[PDB]
Ligand binder design. Sequence first.
Ligand code: NAD
Length: 311
Amino acid sequence: GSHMILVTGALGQIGTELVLALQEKYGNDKIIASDLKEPENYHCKFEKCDIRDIETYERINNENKIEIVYHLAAILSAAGEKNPELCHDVNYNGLENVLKTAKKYNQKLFCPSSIAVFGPDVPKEMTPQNVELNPKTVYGITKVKGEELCDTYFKEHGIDVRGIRYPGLISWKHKPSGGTTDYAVEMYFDAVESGKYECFVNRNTRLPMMFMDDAIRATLELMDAPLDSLNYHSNYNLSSMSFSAEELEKEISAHVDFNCLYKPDYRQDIADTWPISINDDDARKDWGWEPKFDISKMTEEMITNLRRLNE
Ligand SMILES: NC(=O)c1ccc[n+]([C@@H]2O[C@H](COP(=O)([O-])OP(=O)(O)OC[C@H]3O[C@@H](n4cnc5c(N)ncnc54)[C@H](O)[C@@H]3O)[C@@H](O)[C@H]2O)c1
């Protein structure tokens, strides 16, 4: 086959790093990036597209002989509370476009979910894989519907679509976009840049978090697993860390001097409805998941690179 891979949402937090990992794994000639606007200074072949534009999306897939899509395009939780209609449109109708195309062209898919599928009616601690999904955000609802649609494509249409309920992801290669979990990223950036941070959640806010290298590795490992080994498809729980905002402040302060003030905003109301930690036994059992970055190791990577960038 062509062995060609498309990454939608390629310019975002995950995509910035996933494109590189896929180029190194498969060879640079095998990877096509797509997002809304063509970037200036960019070492991957790029095809612009709105994920809602089925005609152009199909054309990109056809012409490039795409066999595998890593579908990252989305509107996230905080933006989705501000703009519910946009969130539904982009997330649900974009996903539907991706799945319909996969069925036409016999594609394999990665379509991620989020811990935002969970609401406060199920356990906050070590949330199980199989509990009711009654999210309290628009975004969470889109993700629940998306899990279900993916699993319908798998069962009814034979599409090998896989996905992870990512926790909050922390990275330094992309500027923070002010998402709900972005207080962890921003705290690092602002600590190193200015020695001060105004945190938009309260000091005890405690969410499942993961360093990007772990999330990217998890994504690739899940995609490489034999299909018959998977007991879940669109929606693996996935865990690494669970810490509060002040715990992160104390970790960062062991390395860098900084003033952290807590001034919650609307994003608190999102975070408060999510679990603190996640039971990912099924990922660990079915496909060998184990995280490699604890808070100390992640902190060293973040601070070292951010200090370099601030030279
Ligand atoms: N980063 C996290 O902490 C996290 C956590 C859970 C789930 N996820 C999921 O992972 C995926 C990627 O997340 P991310 O953090 O990289 O998001 P992001 O916002 O950084 O990237 C999403 C990309 O989608 C693009 N996009 C938006 N609307 C579009 C449209 N109409 N057509 C085409 N492209 C469009 C944006 O331009 C952006 O580059 C999403 O499915 C998200 O729900 C992320």
